Design a protein around this nucleic acid. Structure first.
Lengths: 266, 109, 422
RNA sequence: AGCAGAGUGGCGCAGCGGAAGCGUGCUGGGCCCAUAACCCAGAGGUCGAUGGAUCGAAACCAUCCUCUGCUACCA
């Protein structure tokens, strides 16, 4: 069924297709960036340079990024072109192609149980759920994946509008399985060069105080990579909440060790 | 060659197969060492003595003697360093001679 | 623990691992392993237990017989006795010094804390070989004469060649003690006559008088690889010094001071140095726990210093005294000295070169090996029997003892003379 | 041992959320009187193990092992 918010493409929009035949006059191709509607590419507007081979360019069974040059709205002729394509558009379109595939796979679990004897089943599910998720956040550059990703980490998004059954478990499982494990790249940077002998116990007091105002029972990940370097991967959230945990903790270890003898790295 | 033409005005051919002198007195088997140009060429004899081999009439542009391979060489009656090519063989003919045990069993093809 | 320190010094290409494993049973090993471009060029460590079945031969644990594995060309077998437990005679310690000429300053340092030596000669090269003489002379200067020459590589060397070599060495060294030192030819490819070596080292080398009552002094020569394992970081509960003690019974929990010191921040001169103080965590020798560390033995003293001082070999030749030791920490020093009339440690097959070296000139850098310390320093005043040297890093002078003085002849320093501090 | 890569389906390099990806080679065909250049065509097959989501996993994501690259120590 449709993979996109609108059924028909517009004018000058970047899309994706999959080649199913090669024509004399260009390439007649099916879309997989929308419905399986037909769109015709023309030979002239594929490149601005010569062309020796022809199967080392376009061939069957390839996703190809393209621009919709014209569309007949009533007839359903989607004129197409590969002449204006930049690699930056390919990154943006590959993401939207891949994200729609995963979102429609989530909106396939819904159809496994419900009445789907007719092809239009998924279309019924798509219009009513998809649009209110993505339309509210299309202007900021988000897909319906953002709405679902927000629901798993704070559940009020999918309870603000009609909640389905049995969907919720598989929805949670698939969001939490695929978009994790989930991750902190927090590493402490600490340098010390002691003349102390009481440094061994001094470091222990400093290590356990990586995060202030936490319980004595807080689990953390200590790492020793080299003798002066003390890496502490602090409490694992998303690395946008443990910023204060990373920054101010570094001051503790370097200060605690200077009080017991000599100068150290700051 | 790769076909072409003007290669039929003149006597096709071929080696209807055939057979088999030797050695004779100062007329023995050698192996191609190098492959100079102009015309001449190098070829170490199978006994141990080196020598420099020379092409012979007819065999000029009527038979190509690629590098490496047995070939029949007359020795000059008086000259040591330069010697005179005769009568080449076939690679099959050379391995049959080797299997017979008449030339020394030292060189590979 | 240990009772005596026997050193295993010997010039290039005689094989160290075969002989060292036969005597101690503990491999000589160090950084870069790897193995050894030839023979060990690091300062190796090893201890061992010497027992008897009431026989001059020393057993293995399996004391019925011993089948070597030095070569599969033939089977070398020896018989120490038969089994029913063996009586412990003593615990011995070794000091494997560098076997290569460039490493002379390190060989000197390591040597200077031994109580005896084993000159490992190799029959392959020249008969009055440079390094044999170099070693021997240094040994008689430091205060030792308990030497057992060992002909360590005469496996394929013919009996005329090997005979000529022992003769020429013993005839060149006509002014250095060596006539009361035995010369034991051995095999190092079939480990033969090893049993008779065991008889020699208990005979020629008893325990010399050790002063327990006198104040502890530990001379550290080797650092420690502590720490960085797990679990619980960082840096360590600290740092281990491989040192020998030459005076005093160092007890556990005692505080010890490393006396060359660390120099005060923003010094405009050559003074001031401040000793570092560390409490003794543990007194480990062999593989057996101890509460004491008797003198005359090489012991691993774990102390409460932190990883940076032991992360590399940086505690070579440091003097440690318990605690607030009286020994002065000079930065500029008054050497009395004398020179050799030959250049020691160099001499080849052809007169080229080895003769009389010219007199020292002021403002030249020379290695003064004082104690086990190795400092570099420049000569500020040069009179024949009174030179004044200024040292880069301060030297703790335990006693005025001896010194060894070397001069940079070419690529590296070479031994020129000795003397005594005033 | 910290970090990185990989654990062939011809080779070599190993590409990404669709079951050989890229470059190359070998073998065959085409073009040409012929060769080169140029154009096409190939090939038994969980891609180290133990698991989860999945329609499916070298490849989507984990838990383990091994080999190496850089850094580097316990031994």
């Amino acid at each position: 069924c449709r993979f996109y918010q609108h059924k028909f493409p517009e004018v000058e929009d970047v899309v994706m297709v999959n080649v199913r035949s090669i024509a004399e006059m260009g390439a007649y191709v099916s879309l997989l960036e929308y419905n399986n509607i037909e769109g015709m590419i023309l030979l002239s507007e594929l490149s601005r340079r010569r062309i020796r081979s022809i199967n080392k360019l376009i061939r069957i069974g390839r996703n190809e990024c393209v621009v919709v040059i014209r569309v007949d709205k009533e007839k359903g002729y989607i004129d197409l072109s590969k002449r204006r394509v930049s690699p930056e558009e390919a990154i943006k379109c590959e993401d939207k192609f891949t994200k729609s595939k995963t979102v429609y796979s989530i909106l396939r679990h819904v159809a496994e149980v419900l009445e789907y004897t007719k092809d239009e089943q998924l279309e019924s599910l798509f219009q009513r759920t998809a649009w209110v998720f993505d339309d509210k956040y299309k202007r900021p550059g988000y897909g319906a994946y953002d709405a679902f990703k927000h629901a798993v980490s704070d559940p009020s998004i999918l309870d603000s509008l009609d909640l389905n059954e049995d969907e919720r478990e598989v929805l949670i499982n698939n969001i939490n399985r695929r978009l994790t494990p989930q991750a902190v790249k927090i590493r402490a940077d600490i340098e010390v060069a002691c003349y102390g002998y009481e440094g061994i116990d001094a470091v222990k007091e400093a290590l356990r105080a990586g995060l202030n105002c936490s319980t004595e029972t807080m689990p953390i990940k200590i790492n020793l990579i080299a003798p002066p370097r003390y890496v502490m991967t602090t409490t694992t959230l998303e690395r946008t909440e443990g910023l204060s945990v990373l920054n101010q903790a570094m001051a503790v270890i370097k200060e605690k060790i200077e009080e017991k003898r000599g100068v150290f790295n700051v | 060659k790769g076909g072409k033409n003007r290669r039929r005005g003149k006597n096709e051919n071929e080696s209807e197969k055939r057979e088999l002198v030797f050695k004779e007195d100062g007329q023995e088997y050698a192996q191609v060492i190098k492959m100079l140009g102009n015309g001449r060429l190098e070829a170490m004899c199978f006994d141990g003595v080196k020598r420099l081999c020379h092409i012979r009439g007819k065999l000029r542009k009527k038979v190509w003697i690629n590098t490496s391979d047995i070939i029949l060489v007359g020795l000059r009656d008086y000259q040591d360093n330069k010697a005179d090519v005769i009568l080449k063989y076939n690679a099959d003919e050379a391995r049959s001679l080797k299997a017979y045990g008449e030339l020394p069993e030292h060189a590979k093809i | 623990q240990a009772t005596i320190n026997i050193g295993t010094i010997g010039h290039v290409a005689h094989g160290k691992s075969t002989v060292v494993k036969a005597i101690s049973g503990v491999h000589t090993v160090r950084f870069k392993n790897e193995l050894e471009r030839n023979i060990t060029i690091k300062l190796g460590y090893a201890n061992a237990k010497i027992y008897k079945l009431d026989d001059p031969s020393c057993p293995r644990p399996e004391c019925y017989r011993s089948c070597g594995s030095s070569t599969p060309d033939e089977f070398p077998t020896d018989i120490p006795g038969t089994k029913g437990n063996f009586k412990l005679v003593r615990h011995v310690s070794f000091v494997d010094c560098p076997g290569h000429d460039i490493l002379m300053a390190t060989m000197l340092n390591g040597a200077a804390v031994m109580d005896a030596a084993l000159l490992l000669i190799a029959g392959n090269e020249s008969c009055p070989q440079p390094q044999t003489s170099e070693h021997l002379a240094a040994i008689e200067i430091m205060k030792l004469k308990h030497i057992l020459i060992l002909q360590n590589k005469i496996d394929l060397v013919k009996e005329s060649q090997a005979k000529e070599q022992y003769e020429q060495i013993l005839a060149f060294v006509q002014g250095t003690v060596a006539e009361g030192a035995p010369i034991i030819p051995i095999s190092a490819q079939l480990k033969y006559n090893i049993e008779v070596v065991c008889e020699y080292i208990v005979k020629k080398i008893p325990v010399p008088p050790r002063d327990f009552t006198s104040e502890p002094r530990l001379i550290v020569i080797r650092s420690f690889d502590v720490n960085k394992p797990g679990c619980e970081v960082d840096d360590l509960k600290g740092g281990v010094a491989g040192g020998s003690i030459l005076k005093g019974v160092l007890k556990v929990g005692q505080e010890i001071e490393v006396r060359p010191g660390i120099v005060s921040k923003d010094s405009e001169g050559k003074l001031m140095c401040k000793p570092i103080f560390s409490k003794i965590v543990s007194l480990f020798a062999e593989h057996n726990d101890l509460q004491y560390a008797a003198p005359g033995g090489l012991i691993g003293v774990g102390t409460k210093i932190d990883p940076t001082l032991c992360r590399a070999d940086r505690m070579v030749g440091q003097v440690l005294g318990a605690v607030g030791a009286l020994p002065e920490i000079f930065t500029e020093l008054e050497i009395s000295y004398f020179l050799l009339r030959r250049l020691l440690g160099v001499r080849t097959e052809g007169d080229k070169k080895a003769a009389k070296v010219q007199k020292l000139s002021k403002n030249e850098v020379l290695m003064v090996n004082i104690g086990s310390l190795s400092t570099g320093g420049r000569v500020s005043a040069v009179k024949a029997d009174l030179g004044k040297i200024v040292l880069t890093n301060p030297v703790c002078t335990e006693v005025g003892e001896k010194i060894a003085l070397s001069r940079r002849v070419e690529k590296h320093w070479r031994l020129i003379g000795w003397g005594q501090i005033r």
